[PDB]
């Protein structure tokens, strides 16, 4: 698990989303993994903007953090999980490294501050969804 707080935005992988981020929806895609919900509390996380391809992320299965070099966001086919059936999930960054599915919501960042969060695992594989295309996170 892991989110991130920015102005009045909570950002958490759409699958982990809870019954109050439903209730406080501002933007779910189900295509990124994503979900924002509406907060009281004035969050202090700053997006990185940005076309860095390396950064830093937490693995929870590891309690370390990882440098990593990472893919552009694009659009790469995902497995199965319960979660969603088999599909192609968009603005995904894979990096080589260790992530289980309780790994998701683990930050990844670089200088410029948060790029994504864990999104896939998988044979030696770890998916970050970015969030740097969402200039929106950044005001009201
Ligand atoms: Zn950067």
Redesign the pocket.
């Given at each position: 698990s892991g989110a991130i707080y920015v102005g009045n935005y909570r950002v958490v992988n759409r699958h982990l989303a809870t019954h109050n981020d439903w209730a406080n929806l501002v933007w779910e895609d189900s295509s990124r993994d994503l979900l924002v919900s509406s907060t009281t509390a004035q969050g202090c996380d700053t997006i990185?903007r940005?076309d860095?391809q390396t950064?830093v992320y937490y693995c929870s299965s590891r309690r370390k953090h990882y440098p990593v070099s990472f893919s552009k966001p694009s659009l790469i086919f995902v497995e199965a999980s319960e979660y969603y059936p088999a599909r192609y999930q968009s603005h995904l960054m894979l990096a080589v490294g260790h992530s289980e599915p309780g790994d998701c919501g683990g930050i990844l960042r670089?200088?410029?501050g948060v790029?994504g969060i864990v999104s896939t695992g998988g044979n030696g594989l770890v998916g970050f969804a970015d969030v740097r295309d969402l200039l929106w996170l950044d005001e009201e």
């Open positions: 990185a940005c860095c950064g670089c200088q410029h790029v």
